């Protein structure tokens with residue numbers, strides 16, 4: 001309906017358009033995360049550094065809460081460009 | 084990239100409402116109540132989000148709101 005609701009909707013579906021390609025469909029592996037960004041945001045394994053930043057449980061996959069934190073970092077940054 | 088357009092909606096919506104009164108960088112109770120009603124009680128949500136008890140929602144605090152919503156949307160998606 002409203003652009004905000006449509007925004008939220010994109011965040012949740014985008015997660016699942018990539019998490020279900022391999023392994024648990026609930027978690028983005030390294031590969032799924034790399035496909036995610038490259039195709040949906042703006043690429044060498046500095047994915048590694050990100051993985052590290054986001055992967056709280058050191059299980060080497062990004063679950064949905066963990067992705068939620070990525071989305072936040074992005075918003076904070078989009079917010080500063082905005083000013 | 085829709086994702087990007089989504090993140091864009093996140094920040095501009097905040098600012099579409101934060102600069103109406105008081106600091107242009109925070110949402111008062113009134114601005115918050117505007118956001119939400121036009122874009123999707125408050126007292127109990129204020130209490131939830133207002134980490135510093137200053138009675139304004141700064142951008143980080145709004146961030147925690149957006150997360151709450153995604154967690155939810157993620158459920159209705161299952």
Ligand SMILES: [Ca+2]
Pocket residue numbers: 018019020021022023024025026027028029032
């Ligand atoms: Ca997966």
Ligand SMILES: [Ca+2]
Pocket residue numbers: 055056057058059060061062063066
């Ligand atoms: Ca993890």
Ligand SMILES: [Ca+2]
Pocket residue numbers: 100101102103104105106107108109110111114
């Ligand atoms: Ca304000």
Ligand SMILES: [Ca+2]
Pocket residue numbers: 133134135136137138139140141144
């Ligand atoms: Ca506050």
